[PDB]
């Protein structure tokens, strides 16, 4: 899944569906919060708004 | 269909069509970087180099 466009890719390019606090592994979420104030990961993952 | 005031000068009309431009950069391995690109109403990308 990379070469297709259309119907599957809406989900996987994050214009709909899961947040970036739900699409990441639950240890990378922890890392992001704890190292928030020293090295932000804020602009590195996009949160869909629908 | 637009209606504009006359102007002596030749002019352009810049119509921006607001879409989604989204790139998703994946690095599977070191020294390897890839991207999948998507634009939806005007189709584009999908690792088009």
């Amino acid at each position: 899944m990379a070469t297709p466009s259309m119907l599957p890719q809406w989900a996987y390019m994050h214009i709909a569906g899961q947040d970036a606090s739900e699409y990441l592994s639950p240890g990378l979420v922890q890392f992001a919060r704890a190292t928030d104030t020293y090295f932000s990961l804020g602009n590195k993952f996009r949160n869909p708004t629908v | 269909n637009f209606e504009v005031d006359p102007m002596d000068e030749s002019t352009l009309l810049y119509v921006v069509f607001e879409v989604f431009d989204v790139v998703r950069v994946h690095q599977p391995h070191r020294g390897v970087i890839e991207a999948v690109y998507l634009r939806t109403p005007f189709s584009a990308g999908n690792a088009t180099t």
Binding site: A20, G42, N43, K44, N47, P48, T49 | -
Partner: peptide, 7 residues
């Protein structure tokens, strides 16, 4: 209109 994020 306009997509951007803060996480």
């Amino acid at each position: 209109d306009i997509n951007f994020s803060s996480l």
